[PDB]
Write the C-alpha cells for this entry.
Amino acid sequence: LSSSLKTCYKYLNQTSRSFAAVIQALDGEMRNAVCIFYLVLRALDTLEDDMTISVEKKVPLLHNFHSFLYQPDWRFMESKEKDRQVLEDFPTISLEFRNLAEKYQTVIADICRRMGIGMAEFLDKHVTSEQEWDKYCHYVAGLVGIGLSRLFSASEFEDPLVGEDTERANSMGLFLQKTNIIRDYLEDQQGGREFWPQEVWSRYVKKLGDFAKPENIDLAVQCLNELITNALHHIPDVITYLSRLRNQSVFNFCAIPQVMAIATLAACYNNQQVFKGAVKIRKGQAVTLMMDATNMPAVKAIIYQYMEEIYHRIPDSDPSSSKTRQIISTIRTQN
Ligand SMILES: CC(C)(C)CN(C(=O)CCC(=O)N1CCC[C@@H](C(=O)O)C1)c1ccc(Cl)cc1[C@H](O)c1ccccc1Cl
C-alpha cells in the first residue's frame, strides 16, 4: 500500500527469490510482519558475514542492531557482500518496521537483540562440541523459528502455544540450518568458513579441509552420515510443530522449507558428491514438494518416504548405522 513498503517487497524478491510468493500468501497482518522480519534478518546476517568489518567494529554493530531499528537515520555504507543494498537502504526497512503493530515490532527487536549477542560471541570461535553447534544454530536460525512463531501467535492466527513452545520452534530452525551447513561443506571450505563441529570431524581427520582430499573420501562420508544423523533428531519436533498449525498460509510457509530440507538430507546421505560440489534437489522435484506440502498427512508421508529411503541406504559398516536406524524408527513409530 505504500512508497517504501513497495521497495521492501522489491528487496524481498531480489535476495530470496522463489520463496517471496509463500511469504506474500501469509494472511492478514502476518504478511508484512514476516516480510519485514525477513529483511531485518537479511541485514543482520550481512553484517555478521562481512569479513571486511573488523571484530572491534562488528561487535558493537551486532550488539546494537536491535536499537538501530528505532533510529530513523541509521545506515551502513561500507559492505562487500551481495545483499549490501538492505544495509545501504536500511532506513527504508526500519521505517517499515516502525509502522508495524507494536506487538510485532517488540518480537522482532527482542530476537535481534538476542541473535546479535550470540553472533558476536561466535566471531572468534569455530564450533567445537555438538552442544556448541546447537548454541551456534540457536543464535543464527533457532531464534528465527522462535521469532516467527511469536508473530504467528501474536497475530492470533495461531494458538499461543505456537509462540510459547521455544524448543519446538528452535528445532524448526536448527533442522534447516544444520541441513544447509551439512550440504554447504565444500563452498564453505572454499570461502574459508568452517561450521562442521570440530568434536565430530576431529574423530575422522586432522583438519576439516582434509575431507576435500580424495584419499579421505570414505572418512568424509562417515562424518557426513554422522552429522546427518544428528540433524534427523529434530524431525519429531518438526512434526509436533507443524501438527499444531491451523492457519493454511502459515502451514505452507512453515512446511515448505522443512520438506525441502528433508529431501536435501536424503540426497546428501552417504553421498560422495557433497565433497566435490553442491548437491541440490532438482527444480521439478522442489516444485512438487512445495505443491504437496499443504496438510499433515501429506507432509508426514513425504517425511516417511525419504526416511525409508535413507534407511535402506545405510551401510552396515557405517559407524553411525544403528543411531541412524534408531532415530528413523522413532520418527516412523512415534507417529
Ligand atoms: C534461518 C534459516 C535457517 C536460514 C532458514 N530460512 C531460510 O532458509 C529462508 C529460505 C528458505 O527457507 N527456503 C527453503 C524453501 C524455499 C527456498 C527457495 O525457494 O529459495 C528457500 C529462513 C530465513 C528467514 C525466515 Cl523469516 C524464515 C526462514 C525459514 O524459511 C523458516 C520458515 C518458517 C518457519 C521457520 C523458518 Cl526458520
Summary: The chain has one domain: 1-335. The pocket of D99 is lined by residues 18-19, 34, 37-38, 41, 141, 144-145, 148, 172-173, 176-177, 253-254, 256-257, 260 (CB under 6 Å).
